[PDB]
Design a protein around this nucleic acid. Structure first.
Lengths: 362, 247, 121, 147, 236
RNA sequence: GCCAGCGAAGUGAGUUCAAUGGCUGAGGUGAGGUACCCCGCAGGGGACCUCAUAACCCAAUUCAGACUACUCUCCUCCGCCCAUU
């Protein structure tokens, strides 16, 4: 019994798909736009030293975002905040450094749903209607309360709105450190530095890390084969593990010594002289990822030396809702990630990496 | 859903205490509970002002996480071997009313029977050092899990020797086989100024013991808060909480 | 020319696990080496859990000297035994070393970017 | 209120019957604990300090019946072949071999021991062809038929 | 489901051979197959009358169990390191048609590739002594398991050293994790007169190698008969 | 109120120094998602993937009934509070 518990499993889900950019059934744009929170956006190009200026201007302008210390939740339900940021664009908000299985974590959706995952104490002290979400077997750990602000903005004199206002203002004042962003889709301009001027708002740019790697042993792929043909093409999952090995700044050969490191490169392969590596780190908007994916699609319009380029996006490992309905849990680790392997004939691979306790979307 | 709650056996001086508090606040901890080892030979009771954390520490410990103020608990671990010393602890239910969690350490099977049966304690200490074999009767364990008794397993055998490691892992496997694993929390001792490992790997130190693949971590994170709850219902009142609130 | 769509779902194809660990040596006598760390990893699991379980397929990635950080990989069998072996503090000479694990993943990308702090300001 | 015990039979196969005469409960227990401590660590050997114990021993026969737990008999029976180099007053090389693994149930374990002893008697008869042992065989068969 | 079929590496003299045959018949064996170690340095071929079991043993080995007559096989383990020595083994496919099971021992990864690809062998010997690292490619292993190649693992480090135990258990765990564990049989070598283990113990020792709680015993009891059938179809 | 035993084979599990609910995969049910297929009433039916299938407890002669300990699960009588017409 215990020996099986020593070696049972952590749960793993790894889903691979292949698709076309010129296909009408392609839902990659919906999958990027309806995915909300993002941390690390990296892209890899083999056999390219000097970056073009058109992509460099897109990389240097992925932000900005804002950080507010100790912001109360009842500021987020005012009609000025709804008519200013929510009704005139895409407003993104998330609490900072509060664990999803331990602490309270509040997120704001562009559809208008403020979704907050609470423990039992905060769910009892606020008194809002929710559903049991995360359990401990027979005991209940974490609840989720969803408040649709767009339906409450139509009737501001309803009993639901004054109930939520009394719960947030006088009943339980909750304050958190918020990361904020607002994609502008409105003719009336109003900055966020002037709105949150009472609290210590800080404007931040995403960190850009550039790398030029030498003598990289990249595998050979076929576009019309996911599982890989024998002795001609490689497997995309071994290529993903090798991708993680390269992004860990680890690229060596067999080293017979006392500290033995056996690592099989995916073969057959091809030596690449220059590998361009870019990593953008911060609160990344998904529309910038949409423009980046369209630029990586249009990069193969000209005859280039790269057979396939890589675009990997790791999201926040501390968010309540990712992949449009799915709950991100923390069972000793686990993350959620999506990768793009873009070929030259407008074909792409959609990978989905799932952590311990999380459901996978199609 | 309160994580980061363990029981420490650590007092030498103020400098080592500050170092252990800074190390626990740095790595993964948000509640520090200090045990005080009292044996049956000395029989001393110094309860009024022995420790004085808040008058000597500087106003806050800062953590790497949510940056919340750490609650600091002062617990008492009483080594009880003689049955008359257990009667002395029976006499302390009305005389001196402090030390929010009272933790008894039994050595006699009749005393362990009346500890789970009649004696009002919070958490029974179970440590096995230097050949202590002990049998387990199941209906007092059933009354204990129905009551709320969380079983403490204070571990530090890895630093001194390996025979102590063997006796602790044998007693812990016997506890996980007989007790069936309902509410057992493990905790680390601190004699040297660095005797603490990572907080997420305490779950695997309990998983080596057994108890589940995940409900080990779930059970320690639930039952330590339930232990603070049991100590609070013993301290304030059994159904009432009365607090002076002057705004 | 080729353009089509296909859905493929796998169940546990990972078969490996990686650990990023930052080393915190107590004393100032830091005489580290790449081979001696491997020898300590072999000698710890031998006395702690077993010599049969010590020769599990494990290796070291990005072994850093001044930063005192490394990555250890074992397949999905002895990850729990590796965690407990590194937990019970196996020593080398008599200077007791604190071995504190930063992060564990089955992926070399989610471990390599950030999982622990997720912003450091 | 009970625990499902497991049991195991092992035959010591060696010549030089000073090795057959050199058996003791404490010596065998310390030998098995020391040879598990080489193979397994604290988790493997300390579970044998509470679960494993000597139960049945014969000097001349060389059949040893030992106990072991439900979650540990695989570890014990995997630790059994690695019992090598018993150092004693002489230079001996004894070695265990498993006959059959019986899931607890001491009664049918003693039943299977009787059939194994009868197979050990009857098969050895035709290859030797000697009357001095055959008379003791006839006496043993007569005493077994008196039972 | 034919039980008690393993391989031995044992020839010193007739007395030790009779002792090991009596020990194997008394404890747990019903088919004894004797390997003959031939290295690439000597290059000797003595096939006609080297062993002569039936002319020297006495008419039957008797076991303590089912009391059945033991079939005795004579196998050849050829250590092949040089590629020209593998060409010498290629030349022996039609010259001398004896030694029912031909067992090659590769050391080069290209030689192991052409052994599983083109070279007609029965069971590939895989032993690792004194720092021999070796990788594995998956499509030749797939062609091998589709063909019928059973992988031999000859182990005896238990008396000599502990580092050899470490290298054998590391090679065994690497083989179980890479090869996926379809047809691998483990056997013991006999240089000393006591280097044999239990018949049921092979199951738990392969369980220590891994592969299942049960498929060690299932795989040896199926794949030894499958390997004998494969050698018979190669001979006929 | 009192008054009646049989030492000889072996319980659709029958052990007593005290065995028997072990692993894998698809379907059942409670749910979610769909870029799959068929039919033309906005839609309906089948197909693909993941999660949950627990706890109470353990038989020594059986059965009937009563008791106490249950919650993945199903048939009903209900109460309170929240929101809508």
């Amino acid at each position: 019994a215990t020996l099986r518990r020593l070696r049972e499993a952590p749960r793993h889900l790894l889903v691979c798909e292949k698709s076309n950019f010129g296909n009408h059934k392609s839902r990659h744009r919906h999958l990027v736009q309806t995915h909300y929170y993002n941390y690390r956006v990296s892209f890899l190009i083999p056999e390219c030293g000097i970056l073009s200026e058109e992509l460099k201007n897109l990389v240097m302008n992925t932000g900005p975002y804002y950080f507010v210390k100790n912001l109360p939740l009842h500021e987020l339900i005012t009609p000025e905040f709804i008519s200013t940021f929510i009704k005139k664009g895409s407003c993104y908000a998330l609490t900072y450094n509060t664990h999803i299985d331990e602490d309270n974590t509040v997120a704001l959706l562009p559809n208008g749903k403020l979704i907050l995952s609470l423990d039992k104490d905060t769910y009892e002290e606020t008194g809002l209607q929710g559903h049991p979400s995360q359990f401990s077997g027979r005991k209940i750990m974490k609840f989720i309360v969803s408040i649709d602000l767009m339906e409450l903005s139509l009737n501001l004199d309803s009993k639901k709105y004054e109930r939520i206002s009394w719960s947030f203002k006088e009943k339980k004042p909750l304050k958190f450190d918020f990361l904020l962003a607002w994609h502008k889709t409105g003719s009336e301009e109003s900055t966020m530095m002037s709105y949150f001027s009472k609290y210590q708002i800080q404007e931040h740019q995403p960190k850009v890390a550039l790398s030029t790697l030498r003598d990289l042993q990249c595998p050979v792929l076929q576009s019309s084969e996911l599982e890989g043909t024998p002795e001609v093409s490689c497997r995309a999952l071994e290529l993903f593990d090798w991708l993680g090995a390269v992004f860990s700044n680890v690229d060596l050969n067999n080293e017979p010594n006392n500290f033995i490191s056996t690592y099989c490169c995916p073969e057959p392969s091809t030596v690449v002289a220059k590998a361009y590596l870019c990593t953008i780190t911060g609160f990344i908007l998904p529309e910038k990822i949409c423009l980046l994916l369209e630029h990586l699609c249009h990069y193969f319009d000209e005859p280039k030396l790269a057979p396939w380029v890589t675009l990997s996006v790791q999201g926040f490992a501390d968010s309540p809702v990712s992949w449009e309905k799915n709950e991100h849990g923390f069972r000793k680790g686990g993350e959620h990630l999506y990768n793009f392997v873009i070929f030259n004939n407008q074909d792409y691979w959609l990978q989905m990496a799932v952590g311990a306790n999380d459901h996978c979307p199609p | 859903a309160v994580f980061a709650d363990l029981d420490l056996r650590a007092g030498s001086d103020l400098k080592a205490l500050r170092g252990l508090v800074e190390t626990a606040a740095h790595l993964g901890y948000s509640v520090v509970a200090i045990n005080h080892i009292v044996d049956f030979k000395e029989k001393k009771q110094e309860i009024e002002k022995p420790v004085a954390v808040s008058e000597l520490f500087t106003t806050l410990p800062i953590v790497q996480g949510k940056s919340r103020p750490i609650k600091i608990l002062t617990r008492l671990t009483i080594i009880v071997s003689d049955p008359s010393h257990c009667n002395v602890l029976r006499a302390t239910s009305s005389r001196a009313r402090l030390y929010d969690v009272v933790a008894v350490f039994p050595k006699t099977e009749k005393l362990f029977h009346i500890a789970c049966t009649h004696l009002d304690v919070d958490l029974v200490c179970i440590t096995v050092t230097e050949k202590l074999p002990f049998y387990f009767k199941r209906p007092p364990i059933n009354v204990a899990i129905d009551r709320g008794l969380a079983f403490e397993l204070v571990y530090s055998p890895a630093i001194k020797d390996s025979t102590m490691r063997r006796y602790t892992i044998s007693s812990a496997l016997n506890l996980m086989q007989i007790c069936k694993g309902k509410n057992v929390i493990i905790s680390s001792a601190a004699e040297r100024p660095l005797e603490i490992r990572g907080p997420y790997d305490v779950a695997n130190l309990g998983l080596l013991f057994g108890l589940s693949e995940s409900d080990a971590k779930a059970a320690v994170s639930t039952n330590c808060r339930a232990a603070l709850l049991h100590g609070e219902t013993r301290k304030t009142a059994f159904g009432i909480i009365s607090t002076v609130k002057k705004p | 020319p080729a353009a089509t769509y296909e859905r493929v779902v796998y169940k546990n194809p990972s078969e490996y696990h990686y650990m990023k660990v930052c080393l915190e040596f107590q004393d100032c006598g830091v005489g580290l080496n790449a081979a001696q760390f491997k020898q300590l990893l072999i000698s710890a699991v031998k006395d702690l859990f077993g010599e049969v379980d010590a020769a599990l397929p494990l290796d070291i990635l990005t072994y850093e000297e001044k930063t005192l950080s490394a990555i250890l990989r074992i397949c999905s069998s002895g990850l729990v035994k590796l965690w407990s072996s590194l937990t019970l503090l196996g020593s080398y000479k008599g200077k007791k070393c604190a071995f504190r694990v930063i992060q564990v993943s089955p992926f070399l990308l989610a471990l390599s970017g950030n999982s622990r702090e997720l912003v450091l300001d | 209120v009970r625990f499902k015990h497991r049991y195991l039979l092992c035959e010591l196969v060696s010549d030089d019957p000073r090795c057959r005469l050199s058996l003791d409960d404490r010596v065998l227990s310390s030998l098995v604990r020391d040879t598990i401590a080489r193979v397994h660590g604290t988790f493997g050997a300390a579970a044998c300090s509470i679960g494993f114990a000597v139960r049945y021993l014969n000097a001349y026969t060389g059949i040893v019946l030992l106990r072991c737990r439900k979650e540990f008999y695989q570890l014990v029976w995997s630790a059994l072949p690695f019992i090598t180099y018993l150092e004693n007053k002489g230079h001996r090389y004894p070695c265990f071999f498993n006959t059959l693994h019986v899931g607890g149930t001491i009664r049918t374990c003693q039943k299977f021991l009787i059939q194994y002893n009868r197979r050990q008697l009857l098969i050895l008869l035709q290859n030797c062809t000697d009357e001095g042992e055959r008379e003791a065989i006839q006496k043993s068969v007569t005493r077994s038929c008196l039972l």
